[PDB]
Every structure is written in structure tokens, then in C-alpha cells.
């Protein structure tokens, strides 16, 4: 009962291995879950280091045989593009589910019932899940709450020490693009730069955009405060006769004769961009003219432009010169004879940073700028992409606060509570079946593995936090009122989840309670693993 | 090489038994995925029976036989693939201790095979029970059951009219001693070919007797309408045509310019008196139409219609009788195209159609499929074709028959009892083919969880003294009735069950040597 | 018979935190730890690297040797990655960080044993090095007023210096900061701009002489020959000089202009012509004026033979990257053509010689006042090939520090020589009985981590372990009649070596750290270990 090139398990022996190779992916996801969780490095073996924390970026990278570890892989795709965070409590939540389950495979228990068991307790943890949420408000002064909801995105892919630097950055970046109303929020308008030789602290936040070639000249002024943007779509470098010709010259002298006439093509166009600049605001003070000039620039018009004290750029990338249109509002003009003041636009103070590799120029300060950039700034390449990694992750973790008006409070609030509520409404209800109560005995047991985890990280025992939530919980029953209690990482004992300001998305718990049940429930499915095709 | 003695039958009976133990867990509703592992590291996670059995390499001859098998299964009906492969491959594990222990020669197993055949398809028409086709709200409700728990479940009402006007389409009922009996002549794959619309609604879907084509009129200004259409099917292309042999044409002298002009207009003119010939009130041809030809029948009161494929002149002749003709010097004058019913060319979806139909059933038509977008068009054509092979079955006979393992049990408890009274050589292997059929009902007990000793048991004791129609509920897992709890399926699946299976089963038996060579 | 288990991914090289991997990172890190052990101090030690070229380097620096060694280990490129933070954003401290994050590993490994998570680690020294920090700003006792005098660079200078070839950093002292206030420029109440710059001064080396011979000149001193019948010009100020960048040879067209050959009347056009066009061309050039030609490209066999009778010196500089300092010396731009020396192109300069170095002949480019330059240049003359070569790497560490000097509290110091490890030691312990809680225990390891600085300069001291610990213990912890610490907090870990007895204060030799140095060096060297301890799982292939 076999073919040649084929490998197959029978019996439950196929099951349990890949509930067992799927237990060996959750011990290496479960040390680096949580802010308290580790920074894991992996290497390609062609030279690239990559120290992240985030659940799908490591299984991108890393090859796998087990067909159980890459489903679940595939269970994170679905995760990152409408969660965006969170990726790593998935997997221990599917982990875990299928070694509460393996205690009740082996005393003989259908895996369908089990199956059945799942889904039906993730049915009733989806009408529990509409009552421990909590409706927040619309209103766009809830930054200050956003200030805590940013932390909890923050803390978890950094030391902490780069938290407070980046909590005024993130939070601004995302409530700057977006006006007030329903409407929605676009992350494209944030832009994610990078520059070494920097040290990761002094990351700042930028409310325009960063211009990669600087202007190089040492009598270029390099602070230009309330100056105009002139987009300029012509070239400025050397031009050649309109005509096919050549240059016949018996003497160096001739040579430059027949070069000017040429030259005189490009000095034609800087007298009549230089009349611009004095018709409007010529010498009036506090006032400026930059040329953005998408095109080259020949070293002769960097003189021009310098004695007027004119900000010269060359070589753009055709795709910033399309938000410099937005930000600053200058048309594109093709021709300098078509040139008018109506194309000029407006910007505020454009101050040049000068260093001798590279040179940024900023064009912040804008009236309407409708776009913003997140300058990440480290010394070696792992710190600018782990932070890299935060501010993605981090931008994607408010935009769901803004646009779901339900939040959760985190830190174990959620999964603790609803497995308790499961453990005593099956025992009211008994609306399923008595065989039932295996697999939804066993979904509540497998929610307890997240709080566990967290403070299995930072040190403390799981068996005393547990305790002293479960006697909490109880107490404030008999009070007869509403306290939300959670696990506290730095002291050990519990906390208020709405005082600490820990807090989850409402759409990032939906489709990880539904997500891991449906994908851990597919794995109990499988009766045997065939090889064909070789 | 070669492979004789008895250990051929066992490598027969352990080749059909390999393919038949990795599908068990494909029957039913509660069917367990599989996961198949292939060389690349992508895998296949789905529980289609069909899509597995594609997907399996196998080495001996007899595995690959029960694939051929399983092509064949999966074109006659939609579900039921792996049924058939399950059963074909338990009725050789329940004959393999006669085959080999017993010391039965296999021509005596192949024999008995035939007269079970037979006795297994006379119980499944005394269990089965009578149904009315000519309703159209109960064969609504018979669809159903292939549409829900699907993606057109939303359109699950637009998709039982839809289904049951189309499967009334192809159909036509006709019988008679006198010429026999066509058993209604109903073919899915060519005549209910179906063309895609993009746009428009899904109820507005509708199901058209004709054949239906996406080019319009050739001419700016053409009568748009026919009363009495007639069609004209042709071959050739209507355009100038060069000379069969070698053709050398140089032209120097201005004057000699004009001869090729003129005669590329009698060329093109005289394609269009052979058509014209009849007097025909169209003209369609397969290939394109040059514009000459264009004004030529312009002058005749005809309407020109170019570019139609060649699938679709097939189907014409059944709703025209036009003959189809090569060479339009050959166009006879019988190829009228008489009794069509409507012309018109009123456009759908932004663009311009043309109407071929009539009012009248030559057993061939195009279905109009609209939606709101093409990727819903797919969802449905896979499904209507689905939902019409259901439909099919119950409109080839008026009888339905219990699911779940009622069926299945309700035909080993009539074998076991028949067999008794023929007292033969033949009986024994006849309790193996009854112990196969009990193998079909307790599968879906061994995936619902319940104990397979004690639920078949019962179950059987259930026949002998109930109904038949008490089979096995895949939610609940318990034993329930069939009829009064809306599980039910037709009878022309448990013909091709039975049927292909002992059928297939004979013919692994026949072969006892495998010969080597090219 | 023995199956396989553990491994689900594919086949590598695995690491798991069961079989002790926070162990195997450090104890690989420990292979190349000892080596930088041996390095920082006066009496560290050298090691040789045989280049990947066939040439056998000798240095005691270890940002260089770092780059020089394969390191298959990327728990190991962390640090190295770290001793770039060192050797480009600081001008010291290399051999520092090495230390420093090796040691923080080992002191970690006390914690692990007691079954302490990575991350109270890791949060244990972020509280501790803040508490480090706020004492480092009163760990400084005096400030360099940046007067930019040459004795006040002196003792900034000489500790720079000072650690690599132990004894010269007297007479290497003079000679870069003689070379460094002629770098600086003259101006007051101006701290916005910055000014000094490293790549302002280049060393040269020539076999031959001694040490004490060497001197300092303003300009940038060429090796090259004159190549021509004109050696050197003459005394008179302001020579005007033409750089060119295109080589020399007959002048050419812009337009197409390709020379081939078909026919022998061509022949004696090519050559009779490359002798009329270049004798017009470079007649031209000394009409204007130019008594100096610089050629970036190869010099043709004709130009040379009509250059000596016009008196022009030729000179060759075939390093594109020193013509670009060059134009900040004499003003001189380059030409991409050839036959127009237009004088705004032209530079000026006072006098250009010819002057034996260690006894070759080179032609020496210099100034005296008059078009001030901010380039210059150190001459080195020795005999050892091998030493030359480390007193340049010592200069560019020197001056390097001197970029530390600016704004960013460049004038502030703090004593050094194990004379501030050993007290931050007792600020530390001061602070883990006033901070509570479990930190308690990664605060008293952070400061026993500090007492590898003291060790290692008593090893490659020769010095017993046995002594020297105990006697700066006493030093630094003593008990004053009063409220105010007196007497000596300079103790730091003598080069011994002579004299008499125990240790004595680092004032008297006039050595220090500077803060901008040790400030620095400790925020990477808490960086380098958080990365360590915070990877408790790798994946690598077999390279």
C-alpha cells in the first residue's frame, strides 16, 4: 500500500506531528510575543541582518518544510493586510488551541467535535466580543488618548527608550494628513526616509517632505525663511544648437566662441527666470525664491543663482516632484517663456542641512502640505529597520483607532475575561451538546496562553498573576459594578487596563479570535499527509 | 515484468484498496481536509475528492485505472465521484478472502458481480419514491440543495429560476413504443454552452432558445428586423479569391490597372449571386465579408453577418436546418432558414448583439449569463453547471431516493435476504458485496464522531423492521429519518454507483498478468 | 536507528535558548574579547594580520584589525558595527567599546545563572547607565578654555596620542598640534560655524632618518619628481599655477576629431603636427603667465621637451581625490580641456621647491602667509616600514579628536588611566542601596563591570591583579573630617615600569579622557550589549 517517492502517515500519527511541528514554531514565537518578548536575528547567509520583531517578517525569511508552520504563514499573510499588528498573538493562539487539544485527541475524542467545539465557541465569543467592547468617540481631540494607544504599538517593537521620542511623531503624523470628518485616512502621504551615521535618538518628525540632491554652493544661503516654490520642468544644463552642427575652431578662443553661442540658449532662459524673482518681492525683506528644477543643472547657472541668493535643485525623482505639486502648490512649468508669477506658490521657513555625504532640504512649514515625513535616522542597519518596522506597524495600529470608533483594552483584559465568561455561560446555557463541553473546555483553556506568555517573558511566576486577576474578577462581581483588570509587565501584579492605557484595536482582536480558530480548526481536519507529484 | 499466480489478484485488490483508503475521509459533509505534500513547498489543503485524485501519482496499472474511472464519474454527475471509487474498492477487500483464501476461481466472483448488479438496482427503485418534475416549485426546492452553503446562496432564489428555466431549455420529453424512447435527450456540455455578459443584473439573467453572437449589422444603413427571417450558412468568405495555382500578376503599362479592378468586382459579385440564388432575407457567413459584397446584397434585401465561429454554425442548423455548405458555388437552395423566430439586434451590456432565436425546442440554445462584474459571472457558470446536473438527474426519472446511508443500507438488507433463496455457488461472494454496501454508511459514521459497531448495527435492525428511508444525519451523527428531516437525493446517482462500480470491479478481476512492453 | 527531532524548518546550523545559545554569543564574542583586552592602555600590545593581498600589517588599533579579520559571527558584527560608532563619529575610544560590551556579557552571565530574564537585564543597565550619565557631568573637574594655543593643544593632544608606540607621544605631540593651529583658522566670538577638518592634514612617510628629523609645512607635500629640466622656481611670491585634467598632448576637437592612420603622408602629418600644435599650445600658456603646470592625467614625451625651454614646472598628480584639497591650498580650478589657462582658473602660490626627505629628492609645495590655505601637510622619516605606519594611524586618531573639541563640550575632561572607572564604581553601588527592587541586582553587576578597565591595564602592565585592584580601592574610598570629598580622586593604574611604588595621580603626566570620548563610549557600549541580550534565538546557513 505505497508509490515509489512518497512519504505518508496513518492513523493519527499524521495529525500529531503536525500538531507537534506546530508546537516547535510556537516556542520560537512565543519568547519574542509582547513588549517583554526578545529581538530575533536572522541571517540569509549572503551577508543581510535583520533584527525584527514582528510575527510575519520573520516567517517571510525564514524556510520552512513542516506544511503546518506554512499555513500558518499563510494565516499571517491575511493578518498583516487588514490587521496589520499582531501576528505574533495569532500564532500563539493557534499553538495552543491544538496542544489543548492533543490531550483530548489522545483519550479519544473525534477531532470533529472538536472541530465543532471551536466554532461554536468562537460564534459565542463574537457576541461576547460586542460586550466587553468600549465605543469611543469621534471627536479629533483624543490625542491625548492616542497618546497611550500609540505606546502600546511602540513599546512592543522597541527598548522603550525610543518610545517617547517616537509618541509625538507617529501620533502627529497620522492627524496632520487627516481633516475632520468620517471620511478615512490615507498612510501613502507619510513618507519613510532614512540617513546613517546618526544616532537612533534623534529621530524627529518632518510636516513636509525631504528633497534627496541638496544644492551644492558655498554662497547658497542655507536658512530661506517665507520663500516660493517655482516648480521648473526645463533643463538648465548645456544645450546644443537646434540644428545638426559641429565645432571647427583652429584656436582655444574660437572654441569658446562657438560653445557661448550655445551658452546663449540657457542664458536666454536664466534672465527671464531671474526678472521673476525682482518683479515679486524682489528685495522686499523676509521673503524668498527657490527653483526646484526637476532637471540638471549646468555649473554655470549655480553662480547665477547664488549671487541672488536662490535655492538650486537638480535631479528629482519624478515621483516627489508629484507631492511638491501638492504640498506646495506650483504648477509645472514646461517653458521659461510661459513662465508667470500665477505658477509661483508659497512655503515657510526652508532651512538646508549640511553634511558632506548627503544633504536634506526641507520644504516644511506649508499652508496646505496635505503630506507628511517620518525621518528614521540610525547608525547601523538593524536600528533602521527595526524602527522602520515600529513606525509601519505603528501608523497601521492608530489608523484602525481612527476609523473603528470600538476599542479594546489590552494587556490581557480581553483574554482572560472571555475565558471566563465561556467557562460559566456553557455551564448556564447547554444549548450545544454534552460532548461539546470537550472543545469549548478547551478554547477557553487556550485563551489563557497570551496573558501567560507576556509574563512568562518578564520573569514572573503565570501561576500568581493568574490568581490574583481570577480573585479580582470575583470580587468585583460581588461588587456588583464594572472593572476591567489586566496584567501589569513591570510590577508583576494586575492593573486597570484604562489607567495604564494599554489598548487594542477593536478590528485586530476580531479577526485574531476568528482567524486562529478557523486556521487551527483546518489543522485538526487533516486525516493523512500524501506525497504526490515527484 | 510478469506477474503470475494468485499474487496478481493481491496486487489488484491492494491497488484498488490503496486508492479507496486515502479517500474515505472525502465522503459526506463532515468530510476531513487533506493535505497533500508536494515536491515544490506549496501544498493543497481542500477536501475535493475530484481535486486530490488529479493531483495523486500512482504506480500500478489498476490505481491508475480507477482514476480513468473517476474522469469519467465526474463528467456524468457533479458529486459522487469518490462514492463510486469507495465502493468499487470495498466490493474487492470484501472479495478478497473469497478471491484468494476461499480459492475461488475469479470468473465465478465476476459472474456473481453481474447478477448483484442487477439485484442492487431493482431495490433501489422499490426504496425510491416518487416526485413531480412538471412543478416548478418543488424543482426549486430539489436545486436548492446544490446551491446553498455556496457563494450564490445571496442569489440563491435568482439561481433556482435561473437553473430550472435553463434545465427546461435543453430538455425536451418525448416517448413512444413507436420509435422508442430518446429518455428526454439531455446533453449538458455543448447544447447549454453558455456566453458570458459582462454587466447588467443577475436576475436579469435569461435563458434564450437560439444562438446568440456579438457581431452586428456590416452596413451602416441595413433593415435592423425581419419578419420572416431566413438563414443562410456558408463556408467561403465573400471577398476577391486568387487563382488555385500558381498566380503571377505584373502589371506595368497604366492601362492594365484596370482589368484586376474589374475583376475584383465580378469575383466578389458573382459569391453573391450563388446566395442570392434562394432569395434568402439573411446572410451569414463563418469567415469575414468584404465590403464590396457588403452593397452587393445590399441590392438583394438581405442582411450581412460576418465572422461567426465555426461551434456556433453547429448549433445554428438546429434552430435554422440550414445546411452547412463549404464552397458557395455548392449553396443549395434547401438551406432556407425558415421557421426563426426574431431578429433583433437590440443591444446588452454596451454592445451590439444579434438575436438567432425562435420559438421553438431543437434541443439547443445559449444561456445569457449578466452580473455585476465578470468574477461573478465565474462563480456562477461553474455553479448553474452544478446546479443543472441535479436538476438533470431528477428530470431523467420522476423518483428520489433517501441519502445518508438509507439508501446504501437499504440495499445490503434486500441482498443479504434475496441471496439466501438462490442457494448457489454464487452466495457467498454476495454477502461481501452486501457487507460493501453497509461499508458506504458507516464511513459517515466513522467521520461523525459515533461508534461503527454499534450505530450500523442498530441501523440495520432499523431496515428490517422500519422503513428504508432511515439514514444518518452528518450535523447531528445520530440515526434519523431521511424524509421527514428534508435529506434526499436522485435516483440516477445511485444508478451510476452501483453501475460503474461493479462494473469497474469486474474488469480489475479479468486481469491477472501484467505484460511489459512497448 | 537514532531519529531526528527538534528541527522543523529545513536543514542549517540551529540554535535554541535549551542548549544555553545566550551562553554560545558571548563565548564567541569571548574568542575575539581577549585579543582587544590586550590593546587599549599605553602597554597593550600589537597584533599581526596578514592581508588578503600578501602583505603582513601590524597595528594595536582595533577598528582597524576588526575590518582586516573574517568574522563568520554576526553576534560579533553587533560590536563591530558598534566600533564604527567609534572610529567615524569619534575620534577614540575603539579599543573601549570592545571591552566594555565584552564585559557587560560576562557580568551578565551572573544574572543568568540566577535565572534572571533578559529583559530586567537589559532594563537593569538602561536605569544604571542614566545614572551614569547624570554623573558624568559632575565627574568633570576642569575645561579646556579651546584657546587653540599650541601648548594648550598639547595636553589634549598627548593622551590621543599616547596608548599606541608608548615613549614618542612626546615628540609626536609637536608635531601635531603644529600642524593642527595651522589648520585652525584665525577668528572670535564665532561658535556657530565649525572649522577644523579631518581630511585638512596629510602624512607622508619616507624610509630613512630618524623620528627627531621630522618636521611640520604648511601645503601639501608631493613625492613625485619634477619629471622635466626645471627642478624648482624661484623665491618670488605668488606663482601662478594651471591645473589641468586633461592629460597632455596634442590639442583635439571637441566635435568628432578621430586620428587614423591609411596612408605614410598621414604618418608625417601625425608627427610633425603633435610637434607644431603642442609647441602652440603651451606657448599660449606661458603668455599668460603660468609658470606651473598641474597634470592630473600621464604627460606626453613632446609637452616635457617644450616646457623646459618656456621654464615651466611640470607636476604630475595622477590621485584625483588630493587635486580636490589641493584647490583649497593655491585656488587653482581644473580645466577638463586643454589650451585656455583662463586666469580665474588660476591660483597663486608663494613658494614651490625641491627638498631631500629621508634622502630622495621631492618637490615640496608649500606657502608661507599670503593666500592662506587649510591644508597641511606632517613629514615622518624612520627607518621601520612597520612603524611608519602605525604614528600615521596615531596622527589620524590625534586629529581626529580634535573634531571632538567643538561645541558639543569639547573642552570638558575627566582623569583617566582607571582613575574614573574605579570611582563611578562606588556612584554606582551608591545608588543600587538607594534604588529598591530587583534592579538591585543588575545595578551592582553594571558596576562590576567597570573593573576590566583597571584589570586589563595591569595585565598588559605586567602587573600583579593582586595589587593593583586593592590599592585603588583605598584610593578613591577614604574618610574626610568633613562633608566635602578632599585629597586625591586622580588615582589612576601607572604605566609603573620604574620609579618606586603603588600608583599616583594621572595629573602629574598630564594625561585625561576627554568626556566627549568616555560619554560616548558608554552609550555604545550599553547599545552593543542590549542587542546581545536581547537575541536569544539565530538562524544561519553553513557558509
Redesign the interface.
Known amino acids: 500500500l505505497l508509490n515509489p517517492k512518497a512519504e505518508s502517515l496513518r492513523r493519527d500519527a499524521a495529525l500529531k506531528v503536525n500538531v507537534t511541528s506546530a508546537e516547535g514554531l510556537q516556542s520560537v514565537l512565543e519568547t519574542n510575543l509582547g513588549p517583554k518578548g526578545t529581538l530575533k536575528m536572522l541571517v540569509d547567509g549572503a551577508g543581510n541582518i535583520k533584527l525584527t520583531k514582528d510575527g510575519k517578517v520573520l516567517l517571510t525569511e525564514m524556510q520552512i518544510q513542516s506544511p503546518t508552520a506554512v499555513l500558518i504563514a499563510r494565516a499571517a499573510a491575511a493578518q498583516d493586510e487588514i490587521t496589520g499588528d499582531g501576528t505574533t498573538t495569532v500564532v500563539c493562539l493557534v499553538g495552543e488551541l491544538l496542544r489543548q487539544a492533543h490531550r483530548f485527541i489522545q483519550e479519544g475524542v473525534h477531532p470533529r467535535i472538536i472541530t465543532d467545539g471551536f466554532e461554536i465557541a468562537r460564534k459565542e465569543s463574537m457576541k461576547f466580543l460586542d460586550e466587553f467592547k468600549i465605543s469611543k468617540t469621534n471627536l479629533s481631540n483624543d490625542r491625548e488618548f492616542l497618546l497611550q494607544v500609540a505606546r502600546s504599538s511602540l513599546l512592543t517593537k522597541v527598548d522603550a527608550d525610543l518610545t517617547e521620542v517616537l509618541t509625538p511623531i507617529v501620533t502627529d503624523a497620522v492627524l496632520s494628513v487627516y481633516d475632520a470628518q468620517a471620511d478615512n485616512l490615507d498612510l501613502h502621504m507619510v513618507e519613510i526616509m532614512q540617513m546613517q551615521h546618526l544616532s537612533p535618538k534623534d529621530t524627529t518628525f518632518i510636516k513636509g517632505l525631504v528633497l534627496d540632491h541638496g544644492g551644492r554652493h558655498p554662497d547658497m544661503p542655507t536658512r530661506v525663511k517665507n520663500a516660493y516654490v517655482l516648480i521648473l520642468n526645463v533643463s538648465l544644463e548645456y544645450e546644443k544648437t537646434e540644428v545638426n552642427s559641429g565645432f571647427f575652431y583652429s584656436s582655444a578662443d574660437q572654441r569658446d566662441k562657438l560653445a557661448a553661442s550655445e551658452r546663449k540658449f540657457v542664458d536666454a532662459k536664466l534672465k527671464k527666470i531671474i526678472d521673476l524673482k525682482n518683479e515679486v518681492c524682489g528685495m522686499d525683506p523676509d521673503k524668498g525664491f527657490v527653483i526646484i528644477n526637476q532637471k540638471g543643472i549646468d555649473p554655470m547657472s549655480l553662480d547665477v543663482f547664488a549671487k541672488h541668493n536662490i535655492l538650486a535643485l537638480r535631479r528629482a525623482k519624478r515621483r516627489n516632484m508629484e507631492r511638491l505639486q501638492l504640498v506646495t502648490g506650483g504648477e509645472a512649468q514646461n517653458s521659461v517663456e510661459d513662465l508667470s508669477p500665477q505658477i509661483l506658490g508659497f512655503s515657510g521657513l526652508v532651512y538646508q542641512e549640511t553634511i558632506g555625504e548627503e544633504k536634506f532640504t526641507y520644504v516644511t512649514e506649508n499652508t496646505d502640505p496635505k503630506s507628511c515625513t517620518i525621518l528614521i535616522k540610525g547608525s547601523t542597519h538593524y536600528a533602521l529597520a527595526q524602527t522602520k518596522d515600529a513606525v509601519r506597524d505603528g501608523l497601521r495600529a492608530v489608523a484602525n483607532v481612527l476609523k473603528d470608533k470600538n476599542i479594546i483594552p489590552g494587556a490581557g483584559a480581553f483574554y482572560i475575561a472571555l475565558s471566563r465568561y465561556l467557562r460559566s455561560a456553557n455551564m448556564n446555557k447547554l444549548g450545544a451538546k454534552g460532548k461539546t463541553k470537550t472543545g469549548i473546555e478547551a478554547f477557553a483553556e487556550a485563551l489563557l496562553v497570551i496573558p501567560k506568555t507576556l509574563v512568562k517573558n518578564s520573569g514572573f511566576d503565570p501561576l500568581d498573576v493568574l490568581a490574583m486577576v481570577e480573585d479580582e474578577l470575583d470580587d468585583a462581581q460581588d461588587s456588583d459594578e464594572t472593572r476591567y483588570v489586566g496584567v501589569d509587565l513591570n510590577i508583576g501584579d494586575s492593573c486597570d487596563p484604562t489607567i495604564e492605557g494599554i489598548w487594542d484595536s477593536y478590528r485586530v482582536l476580531r479577526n485574531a479570535i476568528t482567524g486562529a480558530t478557523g486556521i487551527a480548526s483546518n489543522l485538526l481536519l487533516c486525516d493523512e499527509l500524501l506525497r504526490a507529484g515527484r | 515484468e510478469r506477474t503470475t499466480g494468485r499474487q496478481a489478484q493481491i496486487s489488484n485488490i491492494?491497488a484498488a484498496?490503496?486508492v479507496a483508503?486515502?479517500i474515505r475521509?472525502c465522503l459526506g459533509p463532515?468530510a476531513?481536509?487533506?493535505?497533500?505534500?508536494?515536491?515544490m513547498?506549496g501544498?493543497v489543503?481542500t477536501?475535493d475528492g475530484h481535486a486530490?485524485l488529479r493531483?495523486?501519482?500512482?504506480?500500478h496499472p489498476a490505481a491508475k485505472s480507477m482514476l480513468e474511472l473517476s474522469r469519467t464519474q465526474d463528467e456524468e454527475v457533479g458529486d459522487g465521484t469518490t462514492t463510486v471509487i469507495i465502493l468499487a474498492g470495498e466490493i474487492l477487500a470484501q472479495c478478497a478472502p473469497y478471491l484468494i483464501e476461499k480459492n475461488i476461481h475469479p470468473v465465478i466472483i465476476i459472474q456473481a458481480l453481474k447478477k448483484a448488479l442487477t439485484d442492487a438496482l431493482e431495490v433501489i427503485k422499490q426504496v425510491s419514491k416518487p416526485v413531480d418534475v412538471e412543478n416548478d416549485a418543488a424543482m426549486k426546492k430539489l436545486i436548492q440543495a446544490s446551491i446553498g452553503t455556496k457563494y450564490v446562496i445571496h442569489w440563491s432564489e435568482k439561481m433556482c429560476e435561473l437553473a430550472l428555466d435553463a434545465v427546461k431549455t435543453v430538455r425536451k420529453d418525448l416517448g413512444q413504443t413507436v420509435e422508442g424512447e430518446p429518455n428526454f435527450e439531455i446533453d449538458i456540455k455543448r447544447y447549454v454552452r453558455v456566453e458570458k455578459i459582462p454587466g447588467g443584473d443577475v436576475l436579469d439573467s435569461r435563458v434564450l432558445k437560439g444562438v446568440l453572437l456579438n457581431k452586428d449589422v456590416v452596413h451602416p444603413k441595413m433593415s435592423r428586423h425581419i419578419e420572416n427571417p431566413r438563414v443562410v450558412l456558408l463556408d467561403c468568405p465573400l471577398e476577391y479569391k486568387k487563382g488555385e495555382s500558381q498566380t503571377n500578376i505584373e502589371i506595368e503599362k497604366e492601362e492594365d490597372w484596370n482589368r484586376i479592378l474589374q475583376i475584383e468586382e465580378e469575383q466578389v459579385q458573382l459569391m453573391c449571386e450563388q446566395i442570392l440564388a434562394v432569395r434568402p432575407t439573411l446572410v451569414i457567413t463563418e469567415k469575414g465579408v468584404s465590403d464590396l459584397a457588403q452593397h452587393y446584397l445590399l441590392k438583394g434585401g438581405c442582411s450581412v453577418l460576418r465572422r461567426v465561429k465555426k461551434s456556433d454554425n453547429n448549433r445554428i442548423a438546429r434552430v435554422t436546418g440550414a445546411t452547412i455548405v463549404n464552397r458557395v458555388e455548392d449553396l443549395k437552395e434547401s438551406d432556407v432558414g425558415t421557421n426563426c423566430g426574431l431578429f433583433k439586434v437590440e443591444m446588452i451590456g454596451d454592445e451590439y448583439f444579434s438575436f438567432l432565436d425562435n420559438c421553438k425546442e431543437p434541443k439547443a440554445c445559449t444561456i445569457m449569463l449578466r452580473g455585476g462584474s465578470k468574477d461573478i459571472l465565474n462563480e456562477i457558470d461553474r455553479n448553474l453547471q452544478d446546479a443543472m446536473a441535479v436538476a438533470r438527474n431528477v428530470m431523467l426519472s420522476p423518483s428520489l431516493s433517501p441519502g445518508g446511508g438509507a439508501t446504501e443500507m437499504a440495499v445490503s438488507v434486500k441482498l443479504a435476504e434475496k441471496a439466501k433463496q438462490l442457494e448457489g455457488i454464487q452466495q457467498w461472494p454476495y454477502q461481501a458485496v452486501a457487507d460493501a454496501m453497509e461499508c458506504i454508511p458507516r464511513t459517515l459514521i466513522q467521520?461523525?464522531?459515533g461508534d461503527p459497531i454499534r450505530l450500523l448495527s442498530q441501523l440495520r435492525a432499523k431496515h428490517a423492521q422500519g422503513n428504508f428511508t432511515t439514514g444518518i444525519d452528518g450535523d447531528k451523527g445520530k440515526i434519523v429519518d431521511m424524509v421527514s428531516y428534508g435529506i434526499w437525493e436522485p435516483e440516477v446517482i445511485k444508478q451510476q454507483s452501483v453501475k460503474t462500480a461493479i462494473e469497474s470491479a469486474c474488469l480489475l478481476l479479468r486481469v491477472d498478468d501484467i505484460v511489459s512492453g512497448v | 536507528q537514532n531519529p531526528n527531532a527538534g528541527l522543523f524548518k529545513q536543514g542549517y546550523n540551529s540554535y535554541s535558548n535549551a542548549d544555553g545559545q545566550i551562553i554560545k554569543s558571548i563565548a564567541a564574542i569571548r574568542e575575539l574579547h581577549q585579543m582587544c583586552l590586550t590593546s587599549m592602555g599605553p602597554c597593550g600590545r600589537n597584533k599581526i594580520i596578514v592581508n588578503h593581498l600578501g602583505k603582513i600589517i601590524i597595528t594595536n588599533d582595533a577598528a582597524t584589525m576588526l575590518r582586516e579579520l573574517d568574522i563568520v559571527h554576526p553576534a560579533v558584527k553587533v560590536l563591530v558595527m558598534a566600533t564604527e560608532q567609534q572610529k567615524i563619529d569619534m575620534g577614540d575610544g575603539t579599543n573601549l567599546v570592545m571591552i566594555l560590551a565584552g564585559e557587560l556579557l560576562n557580568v551578565s552571565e551572573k544574572l543568568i545563572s540566577m535565572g534572571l530574564s533578559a529583559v530586567e537585564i537589559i532594563q537593569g543597565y538602561n536605569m544604571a547607565r542614566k545614572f551614569t550619565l547624570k554623573e558624568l557631568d559632575e565627574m568633570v573637574v576642569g575645561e579646556i578654555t579651546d584657546k587653540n594655543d599650541k601648548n594648550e593643544l598639547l595636553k589634549m593632544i598627548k593622551p590621543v596620542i599616547s596608548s599606541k608606540k608608548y615613549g614618542s607621544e612626546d615628540i609626536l605631540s609637536e608635531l601635531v598640534s603644529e600642524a593642527v593651529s595651522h589648520v585652525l583658522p584665525v577668528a572670535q566670538q564665532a561658535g556657530e560655524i565649525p572649522y577644523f577638518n579631518v581630511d585638512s592634514i596629510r602624512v607622508v612617510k619616507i624610509m630613512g632618518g630618524s623620528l627627531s628629523n621630522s618636521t611640520v609645512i604648511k601645503g601639501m607635500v608631493f613625492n613625485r619628481e619634477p619629471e622635466g629640466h626645471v627642478k624648482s622656481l624661484s623665491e618670488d611670491k605668488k606663482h601662478k599655477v594651471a591645473v589641468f585634467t586633461c592629460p597632455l598632448d596634442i590639442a583635439n576637437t571637441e566635435t568628432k576629431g578621430t586620428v587614423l592612420l591609411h596612408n605614410a603622408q598621414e604618418m608625417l602629418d601625425f608627427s610633425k603636427g603633435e610637434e607644431k600644435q603642442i609647441d602652440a599650445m603651451m606657448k599660449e600658456i606661458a603668455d599668460m603667465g603660468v609658470e606651473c603646470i598641474v597634470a592630473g592625467a600621464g604627460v606626453g614625451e613632446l609637452a616635457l621637451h617644450y616646457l623646459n625651454r618656456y621654464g615651466i614646472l611640470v607636476l604630475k598628480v595622477p590621485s584625483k581625490f588630493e587635486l580636490r584639497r589641493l584647490c583649497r591650498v593655491c585656488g587653482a580650478t581644473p580645466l577638463p580641456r586643454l589650451g585656455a589657462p583662463t586666469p580665474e582658473e588660476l591660483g597663486l602660490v608663494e613658494t614651490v621647491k625641491t627638498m631631500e626627505i629621508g634622502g630622495d629628492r621631492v618637490t615640496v609645495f608649500k606657502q608661507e602667509q599670503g593666500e592662506i590655505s587649510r591644508t597641511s601637510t606632517i613629514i615622518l622619516r624612520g627607518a621601520t616600514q612597520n612603524n611608519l605606519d602605525d604614528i600615521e594611524r596615531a596622527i589620524d586618531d590625534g586629529v581626529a579628536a580634535v573634531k571632538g573639541l567643538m561645541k558639543p563640550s569639547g573642552g570638558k575632561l575627566l582623569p583617566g588611566a582607571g582613575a574614573t572607572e574605579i570611582e563611578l564604581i562606588s556612584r554606582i553601588t551608591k545608588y543600587g542601596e538607594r534604588t529598591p527592587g530587583l534592579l538591585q541586582l543588575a545595578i551592582k553587576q553594571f558596576a562590576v563591570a567597570f573593573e576590566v578597565v583597571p584589570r586589563t591595564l595591569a595585565e598588559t602592565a605586567g602587573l600583579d591583579v593582586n595589587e593593583v585592584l586593592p590599592n585603588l580601592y583605598a584610593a578613591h574610598n577614604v574618610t574626610e573630617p568633613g562633608a566635602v570629598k578632599t585629597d586625591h580622586l586622580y588615582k589612576g593604574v601607572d604605566i609603573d615600569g620604574e620609579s618606586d611604588e603603588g600608583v599616583k595621580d594621572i595629573r602629574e603626566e598630564n594625561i585625561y579622557d576627554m568626556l566627549a570620548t568616555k560619554k560616548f563610549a558608554i552609550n555604545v557600549a550599553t547599545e552593543a550589549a542590549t542587542t546581545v541580550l536581547s537575541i536569544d534565538q539565530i538562524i544561519m546557513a553553513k557558509k
Not at chain 2, 32 to 39: A, G, S, T, V
Open positions: 491492494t484498496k490503496a483508503d486515502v475521509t463532515k476531513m481536509l487533506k493535505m497533500l505534500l508536494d515536491p513547498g501544498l489543503l477536501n486530490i493531483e495523486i501519482d500512482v504506480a467521520n461523525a464522531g
